[PDB]
Design a protein around this ligand. Structure first.
Ligand SMILES: Cc1cc2nc3c(=O)[nH]c(=O)nc-3n(C[C@H](O)[C@H](O)[C@H](O)COP(=O)(O)OP(=O)(O)OC[C@H]3O[C@@H](n4cnc5c(N)ncnc54)[C@H](O)[C@@H]3O)c2cc1C
Ligand SMILES: Cc1cc2nc3c(=O)[nH]c(=O)nc-3n(C[C@H](O)[C@H](O)[C@H](O)COP(=O)(O)OP(=O)(O)OC[C@H]3O[C@@H](n4cnc5c(N)ncnc54)[C@H](O)[C@@H]3O)c2cc1C
Ligand SMILES: COC1=C(OC)C(=O)C(C/C=C(\C)CC/C=C(\C)CC/C=C(\C)CC/C=C(\C)CCC=C(C)C)=C(C)C1=O
Ligand SMILES: COC1=C(OC)C(=O)C(C/C=C(\C)CC/C=C(\C)CC/C=C(\C)CC/C=C(\C)CCC=C(C)C)=C(C)C1=O
Ligand SMILES: COC1=C(OC)C(=O)C(C/C=C(\C)CC/C=C(\C)CC/C=C(\C)CC/C=C(\C)CCC=C(C)C)=C(C)C1=O
Ligand SMILES: COC1=C(OC)C(=O)C(C/C=C(\C)CC/C=C(\C)CC/C=C(\C)CC/C=C(\C)CCC=C(C)C)=C(C)C1=O
Ligand SMILES: COCCOCCOCCOc1ccc(C(C)(C)CC(C)(C)C)cc1
Ligand SMILES: COCCOCCOCCOc1ccc(C(C)(C)CC(C)(C)C)cc1
Ligand SMILES: COCCOCCOCCOc1ccc(C(C)(C)CC(C)(C)C)cc1
Ligand SMILES: COCCOCCOCCOc1ccc(C(C)(C)CC(C)(C)C)cc1
Ligand SMILES: [Mg+2]
Ligand SMILES: [Mg+2]
Ligand SMILES: [Mg+2]
Ligand SMILES: [Mg+2]
Ligand SMILES: [Mg+2]
Ligand SMILES: [Mg+2]
Ligand SMILES: [Mg+2]
Ligand SMILES: [Mg+2]
Ligand SMILES: [Mg+2]
Ligand SMILES: [Mg+2]
Ligand SMILES: [Mg+2]
Lengths: 471, 463
């Protein structure tokens, strides 16, 4: 009621006169922005429930131990230490963006790290909600896996999005292999347990299926060859082709290689419902006929793209110019959230027609941090900010599509490297796989992680993958 | 009815190994699989290089670096090896059978598959011509209340994970608390119970993490942590020369570890424990020590499957700490069952060093029984003139934190090296690297140490 004692702790740092920049998230957008932001001019704070950066492109190779989970992650604090200014990291979850009081509500607070010598005691307690005040908000919370309303995918499948997904996939499949080996050959249960279904025909599903097939063919086969021969990996894609962002002939090369490695590819197929031990697939053939197949499965990996998070969809309702948003926050040429003077959005929580990739998020981040370099030289910056951008002739953000890669298992990849209308590489094969490796190694954001991936690959040359069920 | 597994395909005798640790694996490496059919029962699918375990909680090495799947040892074997991921619950010497429960998997590493018809979580009995018992010993709380519920043992991979999880959770809460808060000092307190090399290295590793890595980004937090080493004896590291013990304790205290000698834990509660000191004069003082993390790095005791076995063999009722065995590591009262490592008593210390020399010796004895047609058919070792097992102590090593170690290297009566220092620490690393049982594990440890020279240890709460 009106007599409520409601009191939310509000953190509002006003020692210095540097503007307070608040970043939400710890992934491609947030970390890249962090790497470039000038902490000599701004006070930076980061809210994220994940204390590390995740190098996503190598995640599909983590479940089978091609790389280790720890090798592809890097603690926020390690990026923060390399900054000259003051950085604070709230290990917490942003639950509400409050644009009219310039505040972000946080919950599930585990920790706060102030990487500066005269720490001020904030008076926060774990699992007590709070609000962090901001002069500028940079929203990069990303997006979450989409089930498209299909029943059972959450309960019975595994997403391929975060590190614990990698661990669950390994655990489920390892357990399945153990039960299966106890069953006699020809048992359909054994066949089911050794059966893997990967939904999603983009590079993530494809690499996931390729890495799994690699594990089975190169490592499992060495000690349980009979069991290795019976595993069946399915790749299920709703479109007529896989890897539809590549040249159609590279897609065809890819499907053939996949099929040659023994992966069964179902095109024009969508999953209608998922039950504990089987799922229902429907194929929409080119003529127009529709068939149904019931597919027994031991392990289901759901790799089919994302949707806006609740904190973002709630924000849609609170900003008039944003009510009609569906896939992400609508931003202007300068990456300002529309209907806001104060809030910027980069990465997959923003939608501007570009593809939802790290490549985009990383360029957005670099561009935005550079704009913060310029705003810091123009005293009028600290609701006229959209006009200030044009008045000072800031350039709109301009995405340079640099291409795409996909590893296919058994040491084959496809790749198209470009810039502008200039194509520098486009093909597939053995040497494209070496390129896949060198390039991905190059794109890792931290020396440490880069060393670890390198060491993992070296160990892969001499020894089998580590595939521990509980470690 | 009860399933019984008796592989009489071959006339090769069935050697059944229990365990997958220092005894069982060292034996597996030396046994001739062209003369024997080998099976292995163990709830743990991997060998654990125990001496690097204290260095795993803070990520000086990774957990995966110091372990090695049994299967990898078994693929190097020329013959047929079978591994049952299950727990031996009952040795049945009269019928030559081992009962197994909690079965997870069975891996026949041989070309002609036999469907054994086993189901998970379903009791079975494995039959043997020769049994090799090596289930080791389990942690001993010495009847002290609270240690099981409130502390962590330091014996197995899961223990390393638990310690890291407990301590990382503590640093997080503590840092949210205001400086001066006693709950903050409690959360930043670690008590390690055990003054042997294990407890010491555990403490030095935690201290290393605190001073080298945690201090880099939360220096005030790192100053406030207090690590406590509690030891019942009047010196730490009592198997060494007393001068090295003095060097050690003095170093440990110099790194800010508080060392409590002549002190025993009387009882443990959730947030605090009772330590009693018996002074040389004979008086007893007592201290309630608040703690955030308790690591219990002391004590062995025999496992129940070995305890039950006592009351089944005549010459073994009088056994308390292990299986009494003769000069040939044969369990007294059997011609069937041998025992090595911590589950066997023979006057020797319970160490990996002893376990590994026993195993190598025993497998060399099996090289001979396969040359004497009597053992195949037919107190037989005497008449055939098998030399008894002779233990050669090669020395001892202890890392002390902050790049210092102590070491004594010996063979027979001669001592080749005995000291402590900077170089001793480098020696520590080389020796331990040379004692790892597999190329893979050795490589992973080596990379971990290289990585350490350039970067802070990985200390993830949930990985
Ligand atoms: C398995 C996989 C492989 C991929 N491979 C490629 C590839 O090869 N090439 C490519 O271009 N793209 C690839 N992508 C896509 C790329 O990773 C994403 O487009 C990119 O992550 C977008 O960056 P982001 O910062 O918007 O989201 P993310 O990098 O996912 O970061 C979101 C961050 O916000 C945090 N967060 C979540 N909720 C909250 C909240 N409530 N409050 C505060 N923080 C929150 C998350 O923990 C995370 O730290 C891959 C994606 C996946 C899943
Ligand atoms: C942290 C630590 C550090 C150590 N450092 C050293 C050192 O530096 N130098 C040294 O000489 N000694 C050291 N030791 C002692 C050494 O580890 C033991 O003496 C050694 O384990 C003895 O070998 P073992 O084969 O008898 O037992 P273990 O190596 O413990 O092997 C026991 C095996 O049996 C399995 N098992 C358990 N129960 C059953 C069951 N019911 N059925 C079948 N299998 C079962 C276990 O999973 C394990 O695989 C250390 C010990 C610890 C805990
Ligand atoms: C930072 O993140 C990124 C990813 O994801 C993490 C990607 O997948 C990709 C996709 C692959 C492209 C082709 C990178 C290669 C860039 C080369 C150098 C083109 C430039 C030409 C000059 C000679 C890129 C580019 C990327 O930058
Ligand atoms: C498209 O984005 C890109 C990044 O973004 C995250 C990058 O870090 C890098 C980094 C490239 C160099 C600095 C790394 C060199 C590594 C070699 C293989 C050793 C590149 C090239 C890049 O093109
Ligand atoms: C295999 O097991 C062993 C351990 O632990 C499992 C040990 O700690 C130690 C202790 C250190 C010894 C002295 C190393 C031997 C040095 C030689 C002479 C070079 C030894 C010997 C050992 O053999
Ligand atoms: C003392 O004991 C030892 C073991 O077990 C107790 C071992 O397993 C191994 C493993 C094999 C190594 C690689 C060979 C010894 C290396 C020399 C050159 C030093 C060694 C060495 C060893 O010295
Ligand atoms: C800061 C970057 O740190 C780089 C560390 O450099 C290395 C890399 C590899 C190596 C080794 C010796 C493991 C290389 C090996 C595989 C090539 C022979 C040593 C130092
Ligand atoms: C096969 O042997 C190897 C070993 C390592 C490598 C890496 C991936 C480490 C080297 C690289 C990055 C230069 C291709 C490649 C092949
Ligand atoms: C199983 C037996 O495998 C034997 C090969 O193991 C090794 C051992 C060491 C190495 C070195 C140290 C040469 C690798 C080096 C170049 C990568 C660091 C490579 C393979
Ligand atoms: C910078 C501080 O460096 C201190 C540690 O440096 C190292 C790194 C690696 C090593 C190795 C792993 C080569 C040690 C060795 C020779 C015992 C194997 C030794 C010292
Ligand atoms: Mg982000
Ligand atoms: Mg991510
Ligand atoms: Mg985003
Ligand atoms: Mg995302
Ligand atoms: Mg290999
Ligand atoms: Mg053993
Ligand atoms: Mg062991
Ligand atoms: Mg034993
Ligand atoms: Mg033991
Ligand atoms: Mg506790
Ligand atoms: Mg370090």
């Amino acid at each position: 009621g009106p007599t409520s004692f409601k009191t939310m702790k509000v953190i509002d740092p006003q020692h210095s006169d540097k503007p307070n920049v608040l970043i939400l998230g710890s992934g491609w957008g947030a970390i890249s922005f962090l790497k470039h932001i000038d902490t000599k001019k701004y006070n930076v704070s980061i809210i994220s429930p994940r204390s590390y950066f995740l190098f996503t492109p190598l995640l599909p190779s983590a479940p089978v131990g091609t790389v280790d989970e720890k090798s592809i992650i890097e603690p926020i604090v390690n990026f923060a230490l390399k900054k000259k200014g003051n950085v604070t990291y709230y290990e917490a979850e942003a639950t509400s963006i409050n644009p009219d009081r310039n505040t972000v509500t946080i919950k599930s607070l585990s920790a706060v790290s102030q990487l500066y010598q005269p720490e001020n005691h904030l008076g926060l307690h774990q699992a007590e909600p709070a609000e962090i005040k901001y002069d500028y908000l940079i929203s990069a919370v990303g997006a979450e896996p989409n089930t498209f309303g299909i029943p059972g995918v959450t309960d019975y499948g595994h997403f391929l999005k975060e590190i614990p997904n990698s661990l669950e996939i390994r655990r489920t499949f390892a357990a399945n292999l153990e039960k299966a080996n106890l069953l006699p050959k020809g048992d359909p249960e054994r066949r089911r347990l050794l059966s893997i279904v990967v939904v999603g025909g983009g590079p993530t599903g494809v690499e996931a299926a390729g890495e799994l097939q690699d594990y089975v063919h190169q490592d499992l086969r060495k000690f349980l060859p009979a069991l290795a021969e019976e595993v069946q990996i399915h790749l299920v894609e709703a479109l007529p082709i896989v890897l539809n962002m590549f040249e159609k002939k590279l897609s065809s090369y890819a499907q053939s290689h996949l099929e040659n490695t023994s992966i069964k590819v179902h095109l024009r197929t969508a999953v209608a419902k998922v039950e504990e031990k089987q799922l229902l697939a429907k194929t929409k053939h080119e003529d127009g006929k529709i068939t149904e197949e019931t597919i027994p499965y031991g392990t289901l990996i759901w790799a089919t793209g994302n949707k806006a998070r609740p904190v973002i969809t709630d924000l849609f309702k609170k900003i008039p110019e944003q009510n009609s948003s569906k896939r992400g926050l609508a931003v202007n040429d300068f990456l300002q959230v529309k209907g806001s003077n104060n809030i910027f959005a980069i990465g997959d929580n923003a939608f501007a027609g570009l593809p939802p990739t790290a490549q985009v998020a990383h360029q957005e981040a670099e561009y935005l941090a550079k704009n913060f370099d310029k705003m810091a030289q123009i005293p009028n910056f600290q609701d006229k900010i959209d006009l200030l951008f044009e008045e000072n002739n800031f350039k709109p953000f301009k995405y340079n599509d640099l291409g795409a890669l996909a590893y296919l298992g058994s040491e084959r990849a496809i790749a198209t490297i470009r810039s502008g209308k200039r194509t520098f590489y486009t093909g597939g094969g053995l040497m494209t796989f070496y390129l896949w490796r060198i390039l991905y190694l190059s794109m890792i954001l931290s020396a440490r992680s880069r060393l670890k991936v390198f060491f993992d690959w070296i160990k892969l040359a001499f020894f089998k993958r580590d595939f521990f069920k509980g470690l």
